[PDB]
């Protein structure tokens, strides 16, 4: 603390800089919520449960968070295997300019911090 | 210390023992998977 | 705050890139240069990030980079920050690593390119310096006359200037001021 | 046995058998050689893929370039070696972006060794079965040579060898190495002799050299004519030594 | 058959994987530390010479801050993580408090970090043991030691690694106030204690030292040989 | 004891599940790839040889870009998921760099994707190996990728069932200076050497690549080539 | 899941046999015959026909509630063979996929595209 | 780095907004000049004849979407270029997977959804048009995500004269040559250079062949 | 079961060889060994000094040793600095005697943290600062220092405390 | 009103600053150091709003010290300047009202003396001399009129005294006690204070 | 002999169609002291039998407090009892805070059952090992309930649970006829007489191991310990 984090202003975190920041940061979650709500209202409780179970099972076999992963099965299930968005060609995450220590990020993923 | 900061009062020995025991009865993120291997003896 | 001015021309197997009196022209490769104008900090950040990406590309693919690929890469880098943009206006001039053909272009702060055959200019003075350059340019000018023409245009449009002349064999760097 | 299933099990006498097996898997690959000279560093390798129907794409099959000052050679599993090399290049570029100065060799080696060690402690993953050799030049200590293990251990050497028949090569280098008096030509001759003893054709070896010339590092790959001339000279000298 | 899981108790109340980590520590290289009146001394014994090796890249004595230093024994790869974590924590506490760290504080942090990794079946403990010496802000020398389980204690002098029982017995027999009076006396005591188990000395001994407001200093083979010869002259 | 877990080294230092995946690859339909002086030819033997099959439903030879093709030998379902990802990667490269992707970069990226499934528990490796052909800067290329994520560069290879004999045949009659038609004839002969039946234009596929780009041969051309052998 | 994986060359879906055979897939293939019925589909010059068997052995059942011909879309028909609950679940999934394709692209999904999507999910 | 816990992600980055706001305010107060984006506002038009579409613009700018679909853009140049390239790549993937030439409605839906995702901050007004297995279609798309299917569309700076000409001299089942002349006159009426035309005809397309990647 | 599987006041102070003396015309008693001064919002001062007091108590319990004045002042400054530009208003002086002699510090809501020898804030405190500077020294008498503080207060126009090696007392 | 002066010579760097704080609520002695020591041969003096300037200096100091502890050998002035520039640029994008002005000076065995200039928008520059404050234009004009890469320590201090005298001639009020220091091959040699 | 593979998990069905872990958990209720509960037309009472480990100790608490009109008695594990009591207290407090109306006992018991059913179907969990007796008063009159580790609840009228509760249950079944038309003194006398059957025929129901909880219409939940139970005990006869 105070060295592993810094240059953070509380009064500059409550107010977003741009109208599009929050929508772009949380697009997938809102899309999933809309799809699940429509499916649950049309078919029943079982379909969103099955979809969430499949997503959770697939997302649990990846590399450790300090190395880039491919996410093939998740993209097959979601349907993003034949569409290219702005998240794929801009600011490639496979060539990030900053990265932390391995053990610290693995610990942070588990929530021990 | 939190109790004093909140109420301006000294905690009961029974109350502090209960607060301690509320943590060691849960097992099975940060919680352990095994029981604590220690026995305490409060007093005052 | 001035902004500066960056200018480019091409001739017979040679190109010329010039700027006014902070560093503005950065070498990217063996016979490929880039010039930026605008805020100093944005210039430095863009140059550093471009060097990072170019070094990774050259290491991974095991070959030198063509000018058009560099133009596309810098356009993508600039368009990444579409909503909050960098305040820079790049200019690229260089020769093909194998064919040895001239190439000059320009971009805006968002990344819209513009390939031109005779001359390229960008900076805080673009409305002027256009007609004079158009009247002062001739096709297929040899190195020394190219240097004379570009120095004359840069001095007449505006202290000192810096001129880079890059060829198939030698690279000439000169600094001069009006007498 | 009972304690030989995961990486997160300690033997009743303090051993990590999965890490031991990961290190033992190295001894099946080709022979990588490296010796440090007075005015340069050397690397030698063995081509295990020499077949009549095999193409000759790319510069070298076992020697990679990391940045303007360093190179490396691998011995182990190619699939993991590729990932490790990519990560090394990324780390070097990140440090250059951060400090506007080239990364020191020991810092690069430590940064990769942390990643290699991370997989021997968290369960559910398989350790990297790759061992590497590093050469380079630094403004703090000059010419350097290092070595890495699948367990995440490293150390600085002056003449080492990894891969098939490492013990004989190490013994011969220890016998025939001279401290502080090895020129690049003598190093090349010693490397040729050691490779000949431990394995000669000029299409089965790859040799790279690192030298400083007019303030800039130069990394070269020796040509077939040069290596053939070296082989012929060594054979002639050995015959004349009878 | 209760020793294949980290968080499983024995019928008589034993956790066995932690004891196996301690056993892994037990096979390291001997490290001895002595806390003096105005000085602190550390020392380890060197393994096979490996003549074609760079001795700088392999060392078992490190500096955490301007007033704290550390020595270890056990697995070599695991110590390099704990050392970096402690190095970062020292500066973080310096920002937090503005006062230099305490030996007890840094030892407690290291012990907590070691303890964190013995609480689940998805990770394995650290198989290292450490000796921490330094000077407090009041000028009082200190010496501590941690274990893979996550416990620490304060000592006057002790040793770890293989062949530590004989060294500890020698220290118990020959540690007093008449051989701690001077820095030379303390260094001779440490050298003799190391010589009690190592082979012919002067070439298998690495020794460091730190005085008050003087930072860490690494002794060289010339000084080590001088001290060994001075001891040899003394019958 | 060490044969059931994907993330376990044997005492000799071996991974056995990858060897079994390779054995799975070595039991599929045969495939042949030959690169000539001015192009590359790819061939394979079909599985649905019955009359009850629409000829315009499923193909084993797929195009990735204008200048890249690909064929496989192994498990069919594990093939579409790789073809789609390869197409997406090629399109991403074109979007970023405004230039068609070189063959070597695509092979490297596909191998990197394939390697990921051989290091974590809870998954199994892909049971398919790929042959890739291309043409960049006036040069033909031919590659091959293993289930373990290691790729090689070949001049003439044959994989699938009964491939050692095919490789010996190719080594016996491979010529450095060969035209494309001769390469097609040699590939057809090599495929015929191990067929176990009566080979017809309706149960084999052939794809060629040259300066014009990748193209899949029509059945009429296949029959015309067969009639000359 | 914390249930682990059973040991054996069969008995788990992510284990390869000594010559690379997945046995749980073959057992799933064997599971189709558990129903005991047969289905036939024939394509004509300008028509398609689906014929399947019907077997009601109980006189206390309602024959109108026993069927195996489903309607995925107004222009697509299906016939299922195998376990009844699995067949109905897969029909529901196919309906959802068709609706999603219609929403995303703007026209009715083709038969080959629907089959390919179902196969991609099943892989 | 020591201040990194979570892996980074791609997409747009909003970092300079807070700095840029105050910087622009101060520079405007002090009367300085800053770089500005480039705009390409000029007239464009389109019409439907008997069995095809005709597009036109003044000066190429008619972008390429598919062997049978073309587009014309007005507004900021970079946004139009990037949007067109993204749509073309997605349609190429879709055509490779399906095996058939794409439909105009698919492109219209993709463009509308993309432009609606960003609430008008990507300024690009388009004139889409093409011929598919159903028939000729064209549409007009606005930066906020609104589409209209019309027989004839005009857009740009000089649009009033073009719309007047269309309302004066239009009739169903136009012939190719006379439709081209009508478009040329409508565009020329807006300036008072030479103009460019793109003709997509039914007779030059085949819808009974497997898809092949174009040059 | 399946769904569960997924998830108007003047103050002054100065120090010398015999401790610290603080005077006013309120003063908060943080600890039997640390003494503080309030200036600004009452609720903010009370809450933040209470938080500092509990944190110091926790530190002393953990380390079995009393905290230092520099550490406490730096902790308070760090804690206040997080909510910068939120409307907080406080000006405090932290006085105590821990080691290496007595220490005096100042810290405010903006983020200032100055270590000095003489301090005085509030309304007409300039006259008090001037008179104390005129009559300041290092080696003095306790009664002399009390008289100097009284004269400074009288010139500015009573609460008086003295901090020694073993706590603080009130004289008037 | 605060003032920063910097001149570097053939084998040394001369640094001058003021000795007055910016506090205006409580009265204290004006004595307050402003130069920060990062290592044995690096000095950073920075001026701006109080409260965050000291935090920035402490953060940079701790980062440099941590680098030295991890590696065993100190940072160079160029690397320190680039690291500081990156950190300042990163920090300025969070706290929108932020004014920190820096000058960095140091000595390197490999390269030699160095003096880096940095404005409030994180634009690094290497200059023979630099100045921050109120009379920056006049001070820079005087320095440009009187300068050469040959002066000694006495000549440099005389030139600084001349600049201060010209500033006083323009307006002679205030003029705090100031303070000067010298960075050489042997370390940071403190120099005599010139209150004038 | 064939049970070895089918009784280590709660998500495994035996070939006979049984889950053995649920029965094993149910076996844990008989590890605690006996408790007795009964009701009448106006009041509901709870009687428990405290037990001390040795002479130099204080008997643990067997009767807890939930709300102003709800009280419970426990038998079995202790951590599970504490967790369930916390859940009940939170639910009652939330309902009172939001609706300004006491939470009905039937809704409370249904919530308890729904919460307890979950860990008997999923992996990584175990069934609760505590049985409860709940007494309350609401608009429908006095109530008394029982809770099983198998997530089952019964709306009984006089029940006892714990070790050696068969004799008490037999006595309650025999004497349940004359419970409705009784007042507090003889209701408590009946409860104590029923509880006395558990002890061997050599001990006595002294005023050191008895806890009494009483709830009623105008009377809130009250617990009597030590000298507070003296007025309820003098009237008892001999064995």
Are D144 and D153 contacting, i.e. CB atoms less than 8 angstroms apart? no
Binding-site positions of I read: 42
Interface contact D8-E76, CB threshold 8 A: no
How far apart are alpha carbons E84 and J66 in whole angstroms? Answer: 10
Interface contact A88-F120, CB threshold 8 A: no
Interface contact F149-D52, CB threshold 8 A: no
Spatial CB neighbours of J28, under 8 Å, sequence gap ≥ 6: I106, I114, I116, I118, I119, J21
Name chain B contacts of K79, Cβ cutoff 8 Å.
Answer: 25-26
CA-based torsion, J142, J143, J144, J148: positive or negative: positive
Burial of residue D149 (CB within 10 Å: 0-12, 13-18, 19+) is buried
Are K145 and K109 contacting, i.e. CB atoms less than 8 angstroms apart? yes
Ordered DSSP codes for F160-171: SSS-HHHHHHHH
CA distance C123 to chain H (A): 8
> What residues are paired with D169 via a beta bridge?
none
Spatial CB neighbours of D239, under 8 Å, sequence gap ≥ 6: none
> What residues are paired with D168 via a beta bridge?
none
Whether the CB of D50 is below 8 Å from some CB of chain A: the reply is no
Collapsing DSSP states into helix, strand and coil, what is residue H16? coil
Active-site annotation holder among I9, I92, I118, I157: I9
Name chain B contacts of I57, Cβ cutoff 8 Å.
Answer: 1
Residue in F closest to C80 by C-alpha: F96
Spatial CB neighbours of J85, under 8 Å, sequence gap ≥ 6: J118, J122, J124
Helix segments in chain E, DSSP class H: 16-26, 76-97, 103-116, 164-174, 183-195, 221-233
Whether the CB of H215 is below 8 Å from some CB of chain A: the reply is no
How far apart are alpha carbons A71 and A65 in whole angstroms? Answer: 13
Tokens, residue E72: 């270890």
Spatial CB neighbours of I139, under 8 Å, sequence gap ≥ 6: I16, I17
CA distance A95 to chain C (A): 9
How far apart are alpha carbons G117 and G107 in whole angstroms? Answer: 16
How far apart are alpha carbons G14 and A74 in whole angstroms? Answer: 18
How far apart are alpha carbons I41 and I108 in whole angstroms? Answer: 12
Spatial CB neighbours of H34, under 8 Å, sequence gap ≥ 6: C87, H24, H27
Single out the residue of G62, G118, G54 nearest to residue G92, CA to CA.
G118
Single out the residue of F14, F16, F22, F18 nearest to residue D28, CA to CA.
F14
Whether the CB of D175 is below 8 Å from some CB of chain F: the reply is no
Interface contact D8-E122, CB threshold 8 A: yes
B/e letters for J164-196, b = 16+ CB within 10 Å, e = fewer, are: beebeeeeeeeebebbbbbbeeeebeeeeeeee
Chain H: list its partners (3+ Cβ pairs within 8 Å). Answer: A, C, F, G, J
Q: Which residue pairs from D188-191 have beta carbons closer than 8 angstroms and sit at least 24 positions apart in sequence? A: D188/D42, D188/D230, D189/D230, D189/D234, D190/D35, D191/D33, D191/D35, D191/D42, D191/D44
**Which CATH number among 3.60.20.10, 3.40.50.150, 3.40.50.720, 3.30.1490.20 corresponds to the domain C1-179?**
3.60.20.10
Whether the CB of I6 is below 8 Å from some CB of chain K: the reply is no
How far apart are alpha carbons D96 and J79 in whole angstroms? Answer: 10
Are F96 and F60 contacting, i.e. CB atoms less than 8 angstroms apart? no
Query: Which of F56, F95, F213 is nearest residue H85 as measured by Cβ atoms?
Result: F95
Name chain J contacts of H15, Cβ cutoff 8 Å.
Answer: 93
Domains of chain D: 1-242 (3.60.20.10)
Helix segments in D15-104, DSSP class H: 17-24, 78-99
Instruction: Map K194-236 to HEC letters.
Output: HHHCCCCCCCCCCCCCEEEEEECCCCCCEEECHHHHHHHCCCC
Chain G: list its partners (3+ Cβ pairs within 8 Å). Answer: A, F, H, K
Tokens, residue A84: 């290219």
Interface contact G3-K124, CB threshold 8 A: no
CA A22-A23-A29 angle, 5° bins: 105
How far apart are alpha carbons J178 and J196 in whole angstroms? Answer: 9
Residue in C closest to D58 by C-alpha: C62
Are D147 and E45 contacting, i.e. CB atoms less than 8 angstroms apart? no
Residue in B closest to I50 by C-alpha: B5
Chain J: list its partners (3+ Cβ pairs within 8 Å). Answer: A, C, D, E, H, I
Among F64, F77, F83, F88, the strongest candidate for a mutation testing the A interface, having the largest count of A CBs within 10 A, is: F88
Domains of chain F: 1-229 (3.60.20.10)
Residue I171: count of CB within 10 angstroms of its CB: 11
Please state, in angstroms and as integers, the Cα–Cα distance from residue F219 to each residue in F191, F200, F201, K192, K235, following that order: 17, 10, 6, 98, 108
Find the helix or strand (DSSP H, E) in which D171 lies: helix D166-176
How far apart are alpha carbons E189 and D241 in whole angstroms? Answer: 56
Terminal C-alpha separation, chain J:
18
Are J6 and J130 contacting, i.e. CB atoms less than 8 angstroms apart? yes
> What residues are paired with D212 via a beta bridge?
D217
Q: What is the dihedral of CA J40, J42, J47, J50, to 10 degrees?
A: -40
Whether the CB of D10 is below 8 Å from some CB of chain E: the reply is yes
Single out the residue of F62, F143, F80, F81 nearest to residue F108, CA to CA.
F143
Are D169 and D194 contacting, i.e. CB atoms less than 8 angstroms apart? yes
Radius of gyration of chain K from Cα atoms?
19
DSSP state of K61: P
Radius of gyration of chain F from Cα atoms?
18
How far apart are alpha carbons F122 and A63 in whole angstroms? Answer: 12
Beta strand I113-115 with I102-108: parallel, antiparallel or unpaired? antiparallel
Name chain H contacts of G106, Cβ cutoff 8 Å.
Answer: 103, 105-106, 108-109
How far apart are alpha carbons D163 and J96 in whole angstroms? Answer: 57
> Chains I vs J: touching, with 3+ CB pairs under 8 Å?
yes
Residue in E closest to A104 by C-alpha: E85
How far apart are alpha carbons H156 and H75 in whole angstroms? Answer: 9
Interface contact A95-C83, CB threshold 8 A: no
CA distance E138 to chain I (A): 9
Q: Phi first, then psi: give them for residue J14, nearest 5 degrees.
A: -105, 130
Establish whether I9 is a catalytic residue: yes
B/e letters for D202-231, b = 16+ CB within 10 Å, e = fewer, are: beebbbbbbeeeeeebebeebeeeebeebb
Tokens, residue G45: 């010059």
Tokens, residue C69: 């690929």
Q: After which residues is chain H broken (C to N over 2.5 A)?
A: 59, 192
CA H212-F227-F31 angle, 5° bins: 55
Collapsing DSSP states into helix, strand and coil, what is residue J88? helix
Spatial CB neighbours of G51, under 8 Å, sequence gap ≥ 6: G39, G40, G41, G42
Tokens, residue J78: 């160029």
Are C85 and C109 contacting, i.e. CB atoms less than 8 angstroms apart? yes
Collapsing DSSP states into helix, strand and coil, what is residue F216? strand
Are H126 and H114 contacting, i.e. CB atoms less than 8 angstroms apart? no
Terminal C-alpha separation, chain A:
11
CA distance J66 to chain E (A): 7
Helix segments in C65-157, DSSP class H: 67-80, 130-135, 143-157
> Chains I vs K: touching, with 3+ CB pairs under 8 Å?
yes
Single out the residue of J58, J13, J59, J68 nearest to residue J183, CA to CA.
J13
How far apart are alpha carbons I80 and J196 in whole angstroms? Answer: 39
Whether the CB of J127 is below 8 Å from some CB of chain C: the reply is no
How far apart are alpha carbons I111 and J53 in whole angstroms? Answer: 10
> Chains K vs J: touching, with 3+ CB pairs under 8 Å?
no
Helix segments in K20-165, DSSP class H: 20-26, 79-99, 105-117
Query: Which of E52, E56, E121 is nearest residue D159 as measured by Cβ atoms?
Result: E52
How far apart are alpha carbons I49 and I35 in whole angstroms? Answer: 10
Name chain C contacts of J89, Cβ cutoff 8 Å.
Answer: 41, 45
Q: What is the dihedral of CA I118, I122, I125, I129, to 10 degrees?
A: 10
* Resolution for this PDB entry, in angstroms: 3.0
Whether the CB of C22 is below 8 Å from some CB of chain A: the reply is no
Collapsing DSSP states into helix, strand and coil, what is residue D71? strand
Name chain E contacts of B33, Cβ cutoff 8 Å.
Answer: 7, 119-121
Are D138 and D68 contacting, i.e. CB atoms less than 8 angstroms apart? no
Whether the CB of A109 is below 8 Å from some CB of chain E: the reply is no
Interface contact J95-A9, CB threshold 8 A: yes
Binding-site positions of I for bortezomib read: 42
Find the helix or strand (DSSP H, E) in which I113 lies: strand I113-115
Count how many residues are written for chain I: 172
Domains of chain I: 9-172 (3.60.20.10)
Helix segments in chain K, DSSP class H: 20-26, 79-99, 105-117, 166-175, 184-196
CA C94-C97-C102 angle, 5° bins: 35
Among E65, E123, E125, the strongest candidate for a mutation testing the A interface, having the largest count of A CBs within 10 A, is: E123
Interface contact F113-A72, CB threshold 8 A: yes
Spatial CB neighbours of C127, under 8 Å, sequence gap ≥ 6: none
Name chain I contacts of K118, Cβ cutoff 8 Å.
Answer: 1, 4
Q: Which residue pairs from D209-217 have beta carbons closer than 8 angstroms and sit at least 24 positions apart in sequence? A: D209/D40, D209/D41, D209/D42, D209/D43, D209/D184, D210/D40, D210/D41, D210/D71, D210/D135, D210/D136, D210/D137, D210/D143, D211/D39, D211/D40, D211/D184, D212/D39, D212/D40, D212/D137, D217/D68, D217/D69, D217/D137
Whether the CB of I46 is below 8 Å from some CB of chain A: the reply is no
Count how many residues are written for chain H: 215
Burial of residue G63 (CB within 10 Å: 0-12, 13-18, 19+) is exposed
Strands in E31-35's sheet, in edge-to-edge order, are E157-160, E31-35, E39-45, E205-211, E216-218
How far apart are alpha carbons K71 and K48 in whole angstroms? Answer: 12
Q: Which residues of H are catalytic?
A: 42
CA distance H213 to chain F (A): 6
State the fold for domain E1-235: 3.60.20
Collapsing DSSP states into helix, strand and coil, what is residue K93? helix
How far apart are alpha carbons F129 and F106 in whole angstroms? Answer: 15
CA distance E58 to chain B (A): 36
Among chain B, residues having any CB pair with chain I shorter than 8 Å are 1-2, 4-5
CA distance I82 to chain A (A): 7
């Amino acid at each position: 603390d105070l060295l592993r984090k810094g240059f953070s202003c509380v009064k500059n975190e409550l107010l977003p800089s741009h109208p599009l920041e929050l929508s772009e940061k949380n697009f997938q979650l809102n899309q999933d919520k809309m799809n699940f709500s429509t499916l649950r209202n049309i078919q029943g409780l079982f379909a969103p449960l099955k979809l969430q179970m499949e997503f959770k099972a697939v997302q649990q076999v990846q590399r450790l968070p300090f190395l880039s992963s491919s996410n093939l099965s998740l993209d097959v299930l979601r349907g993003n295997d034949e569409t290219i968005g702005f998240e794929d060609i801009l600011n490639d995450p496979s060539q990030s300019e900053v990265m932390g220590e391995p053990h610290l990020m693995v610990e942070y993923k588990l929530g021990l911090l | 210390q939190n109790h004093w900061f909140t109420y301006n009062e000294t905690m009961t020995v029974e109350s502090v023992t209960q607060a301690v025991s509320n943590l060691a009865l849960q097992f099975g993120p940060g919680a352990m998977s095994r029981p604590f291997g220690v026995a305490l003896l409060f007093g005052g | 705050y001035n902004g500066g001015a960056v200018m480019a021309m091409k001739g017979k197997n040679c190109v010329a890139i010039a700027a006014d009196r902070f560093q503005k022209i950065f070498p990217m490769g063996d016979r490929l240069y880039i010039g930026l104008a605008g805020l100093a900090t944005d210039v430095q950040t863009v140059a550093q990030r471009l060097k990072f990406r170019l070094n990774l590309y050259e290491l991974k693919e095991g070959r030198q980079i063509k000018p058009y690929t560099l133009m596309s890469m810098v356009a993508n880098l600039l368009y990444e920050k579409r909503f909050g943009p960098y305040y820079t206006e790049p200019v690229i001039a260089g020769l093909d690593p194998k064919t040895f053909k001239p190439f000059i272009c320009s971009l805006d702060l968002i990344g819209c390119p513009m390939v031109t055959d005779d001359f390229v200019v960008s900076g805080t003075c673009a409305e002027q310096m256009y007609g004079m350059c158009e009247s002062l340019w001739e096709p297929n000018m040899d190195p020394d006359h190219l240097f004379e023409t570009i120095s004359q245009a840069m001095l007449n449009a505006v202290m000192g200037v810096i001129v880079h002349i890059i060829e198939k064999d030698k690279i000439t760097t000169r600094t001069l001021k009006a007498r | 046995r009972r304690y030989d299933s995961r990486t997160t099990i300690f033997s009743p006498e303090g051993r990590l058998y999965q890490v031991e097996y990961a290190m033992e898997a190295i001894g099946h690959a080709g022979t990588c050689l490296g010796i440090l000279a007075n005015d340069g560093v050397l690397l030698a390798a063995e081509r295990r893929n020499i077949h009549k129907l095999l193409d000759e794409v790319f510069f070298s099959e076992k020697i990679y370039k990391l940045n303007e000052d360093m190179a490396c050679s691998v011995a182990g599993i190619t699939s993991d070696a590729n990932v490790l090399t990519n990560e090394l290049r990324l780390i070097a570029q990140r440090y250059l972006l951060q400090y506007q100065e080239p990364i020191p060799c020991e810092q690069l080696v430590t940064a990769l060794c942390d990643i290699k060690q991370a997989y021997t402690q968290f369960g559910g993953k398989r350790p990297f079965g790759v061992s590497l050799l590093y050469i380079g030049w630094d403004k703090h200590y000059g010419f350097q040579l290092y070595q890495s293990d699948p367990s995440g251990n490293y150390g600085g050497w002056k003449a080492t060898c990894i891969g098939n028949n490492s013990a004989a090569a190490v013994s011969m280098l220890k016998q025939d190495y001279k401290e502080g008096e090895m020129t690049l030509k003598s190093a090349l001759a010693l490397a040729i002799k050691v490779l000949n003893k431990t394995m000669l054709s000029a299409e089965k070896v790859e040799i790279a050299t690192l030298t400083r010339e007019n303030g800039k590092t130069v990394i070269r790959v020796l040509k077939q004519k040069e290596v053939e001339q070296l082989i012929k000279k060594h054979e002639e000298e050995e015959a004349k030594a009878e | 058959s209760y020793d294949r899981a980290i968080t499983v108790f024995s019928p008589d109340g034993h956790l066995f994987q932690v004891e196996y980590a301690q056993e892994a520590v037990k096979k390291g290289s001997t490290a001895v530390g002595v806390r003096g009146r105005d000085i602190v001394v550390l020392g380890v014994e060197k393994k096979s010479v490996a003549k074609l090796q760079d001795e700088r890249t392999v060392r078992k004595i490190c500096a955490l801050d301007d007033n704290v230093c550390m020595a270890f024994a056990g697995l070599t790869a695991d110590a390099r993580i704990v050392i970096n974590r402690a190095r970062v924590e020292c500066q973080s506490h310096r920002l937090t408090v503005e006062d230099p760290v305490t030996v007890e504080y840094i030892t407690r942090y290291i012990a907590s970090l070691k303890q964190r990794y013995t609480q689940s079946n998805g990770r394995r403990p650290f198989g290292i043991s450490a000796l921490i010496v330094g000077f407090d802000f009041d000028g009082t020398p200190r010496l501590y030691q941690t274990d893979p389980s996550g416990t620490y204690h304060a000592w006057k002098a002790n040793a770890i690694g293989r062949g530590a029982k004989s060294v500890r017995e020698f220290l118990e027999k020959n540690y007093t106030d008449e051989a701690i009076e001077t820095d030379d006396l303390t260094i001779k005591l440490v050298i003799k204690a190391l010589l009690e188990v190592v082979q012919s000395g002067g070439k298998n001994i690495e020794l460091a030292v730190m005085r008050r407001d003087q930072s860490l200093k690494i002794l060289n083979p010339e000084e080590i040989e001088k001290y060994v010869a001075e001891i040899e002259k003394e019958k | 004891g060490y044969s059931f877990s994907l993330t376990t080294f044997s005492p000799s230092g071996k991974l056995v599940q990858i060897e079994y995946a390779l054995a799975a690859v070595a039991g599929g339909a045969p495939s042949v790839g030959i690169k000539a002086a001015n192009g590359v030819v790819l061939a394979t033997e079909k599985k649905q040889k019955s009359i009850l099959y629409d000829e315009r439903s499923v193909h084993k030879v797929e195009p990735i870009t204008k200048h890249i093709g690909l064929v496989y030998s192994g498990m069919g379902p594990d093939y579409r998921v790789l073809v789609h990802r390869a197409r997406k990667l090629a399109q991403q490269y074109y979007l970023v760099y405004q230039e068609p992707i070189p063959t070597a970069q695509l092979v490297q990226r596909v191998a990197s994707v394939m390697q990921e499934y051989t290091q974590s528990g809870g998954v199994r490796p892909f049971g398919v190996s790929l042959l890739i052909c291309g043409w960049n800067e006036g040069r033909p290329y031919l590659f091959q990728s293993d289930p373990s994520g290691a790729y090689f560069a070949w001049k003439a290879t044959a994989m699938g069932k009964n491939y050692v004999n095919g490789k010996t045949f190719l080594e016996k009659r491979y010529n450095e200076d060969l035209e494309l038609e001769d390469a097609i004839h040699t590939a057809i002969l090599t495929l015929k050497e191990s067929f176990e039946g009566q080979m017809t234009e309706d149960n084999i596929e052939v794809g060629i690549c040259n300066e014009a780009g990748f193209r899949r041969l029509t059945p009429t051309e296949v029959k015309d080539y067969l009639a000359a052998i | 899941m914390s249930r682990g994986s059973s040991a054996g060359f069969d008995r788990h879906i992510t284990i390869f046999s000594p010559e690379g055979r997945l046995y749980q897939v073959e057992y799933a293939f064997k599971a189709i015959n558990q129903g005991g019925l047969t289905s036939v589909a024939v394509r004509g010059k300008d028509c398609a026909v689906i014929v399947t068997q019907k077997k009601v052995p109980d006189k206390l059942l309602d024959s109108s509630t026993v069927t195996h011909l489903f309607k995925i879309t107004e222009n697509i028909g299906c016939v299922m063979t195998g376990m009844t609950a699995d067949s109905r679940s897969q029909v529901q999934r196919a309906r959802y996929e068709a609706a999603n394709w219609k929403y995303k692209y703007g026209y009715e999904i083709p038969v080959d595209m629907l089959c390919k999507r179902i196969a991609d999910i099943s892989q | 780095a020591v201040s990194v816990y979570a892996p980074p992600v791609g997409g747009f980055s909003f970092d300079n907004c807070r700095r840029n706001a105050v910087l622009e305010a101060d520079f405007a107060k002090r009367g300085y000049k800053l770089p500005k984006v480039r705009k390409t506002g000029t007239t464009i038009a389109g019409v439907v004849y008997k069995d095809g579409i005709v597009l036109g613009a003044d000066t190429s700018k008619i972008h390429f979407i598919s062997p049978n679909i073309y587009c014309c853009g007005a507004g900021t140049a970079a946004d139009t270029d990037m949007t067109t390239q993204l749509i073309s790549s997605n349609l190429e993937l879709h055509s490779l997977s399906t095996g058939r030439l794409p439909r105009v409605v698919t492109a219209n839906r993709m463009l509308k959804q993309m432009l609606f995702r960003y609430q008008g901050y990507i300024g690009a007004a388009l004139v889409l048009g093409g011929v598919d297995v159903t028939g000729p279609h064209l549409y007009s798309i606005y930066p906020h995500g609104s589409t209209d299917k019309l027989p004839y569309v005009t857009m740009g700076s000089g649009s009033l004269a073009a719309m007047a000409v269309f309302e004066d001299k239009f009739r169903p089942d136009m012939e190719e040559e006379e439709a081209k002349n009508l478009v040329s006159e409508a565009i020329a009426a807006g300036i008072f250079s030479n103009i460019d035309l793109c003709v997509i005809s039914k007779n030059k397309l085949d819808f009974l062949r497997p898809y092949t990647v174009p040059n | 079961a399946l769904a569960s599987v997924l998830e108007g006041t003047t103050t002054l102070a100065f120090k010398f060889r015999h401790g610290v003396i603080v005077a006013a015309d309120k003063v908060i008693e943080i600890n039997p060994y640390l003494l503080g001064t309030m200036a600004g919002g009452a609720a903010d001062c009370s809450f933040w000094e209470r938080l500092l007091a509990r944190q110091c108590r926790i530190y002393e319990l953990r380390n079995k040793e009393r905290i230092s004045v520099a550490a406490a002042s730096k902790l308070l400054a760090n804690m206040v600095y997080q909510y910068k530009g939120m409307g907080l208003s406080m000006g405090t002086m932290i006085c105590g005697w821990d080691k290496r002699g007595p220490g005096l510090y100042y810290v405010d809501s903006e983020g200032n943290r100055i270590s000095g020898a003489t301090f005085s804030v509030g309304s007409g405190s300039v006259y008090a600062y001037g008179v104390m500077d005129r009559g300041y020294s290092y080696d003095l008498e306790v009664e002399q220092a009390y008289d100097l503080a009284r004269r400074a207060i009288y010139q500015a126009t009573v609460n008086l405390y003295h901090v020694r090696e073993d706590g603080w007392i009130r004289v008037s | 009103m605060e003032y920063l002066i910097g001149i570097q010579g053939p084998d040394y760097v001369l640094v001058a600053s003021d000795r007055v704080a910016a506090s205006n609520i409580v009265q204290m002695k004006d004595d307050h150091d402003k130069m920060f020591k990062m290592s044995e041969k690096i000095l950073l003096l920075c001026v701006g709003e109080a409260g965050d300037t000291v935090q920035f200096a402490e953060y940079i100091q701790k980062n440099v010290q941590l680098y030295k502890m991890r590696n065993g050998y100190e940072l160079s002035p160029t690397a320190a300047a680039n690291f500081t520039r990156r950190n300042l640029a990163d920090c300025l994008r969070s706290r929108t009202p932020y004014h920190v002005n820096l000058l960095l000076a140091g000595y390197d065995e490999h390269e030699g003396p160095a003096l880096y200039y940095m404005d409030y928008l994180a634009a690094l520059a290497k200059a023979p001399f630099a100045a921050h404050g109120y009379g920056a234009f006049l001070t820079l004009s005087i320095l440009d009129r009187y300068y050469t890469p040959t002066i000694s320590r006495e000549r440099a201090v005389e030139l600084l005294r001349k600049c201060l005298e010209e500033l006083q001639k323009r307006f002679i009020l205030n003029l705090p006690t100031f303070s000067v220091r010298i960075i050489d091959k042997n370390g940071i040699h403190d120099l005599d204070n010139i209150s004038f | 002999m064939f049970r070895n593979q089918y009784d280590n998990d709660v998500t495994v069905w035996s070939p006979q169609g049984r889950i053995h872990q649920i029965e094993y958990a149910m076996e844990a209720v008989k590890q605690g002291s006996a408790t007795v509960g009964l009701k009448s037309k106006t009041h509901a009472v709870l009687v428990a039998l405290k037990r001390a480990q040795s002479e130099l100790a204080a008997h643990q608490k067997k009767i807890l407090h939930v709300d102003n009109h709800i009280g419970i008695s426990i038998a079995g594990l202790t951590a599970d009892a504490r967790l369930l009591c916390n859940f009940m207290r939170q639910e009652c407090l939330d309902s009172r805070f939001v609706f300004d109306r006491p939470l009905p006992v039937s809704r409370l018991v249904s919530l308890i059952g729904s919460k307890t059913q979950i860990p008997t179907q999923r992996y990584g969990r175990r069934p609760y090992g505590v049985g409860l007796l709940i007494a309350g008063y609401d608009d429908m009159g006095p109530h008394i309930f029982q809770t099983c580790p198998s997530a089952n609840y019964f709306d009984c009228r006089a029940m006892s649970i714990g070790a050696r509760s068969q004799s008490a249950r037999t006595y309650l079944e025999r004497h349940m006829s004359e419970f409705m038309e009784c007042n507090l003194n003889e209701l408590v006398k009946h409860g104590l007489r029923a509880l006395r059957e558990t002890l061997p025929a050599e001990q006595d129901l002294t005023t050191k191991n008895v806890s009494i909880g009483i709830v009623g219409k105008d009377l809130e939940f009250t617990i009597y310990d030590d000298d507070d139970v003296s007025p309820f005990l003098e009237g008892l006869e001999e064995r």
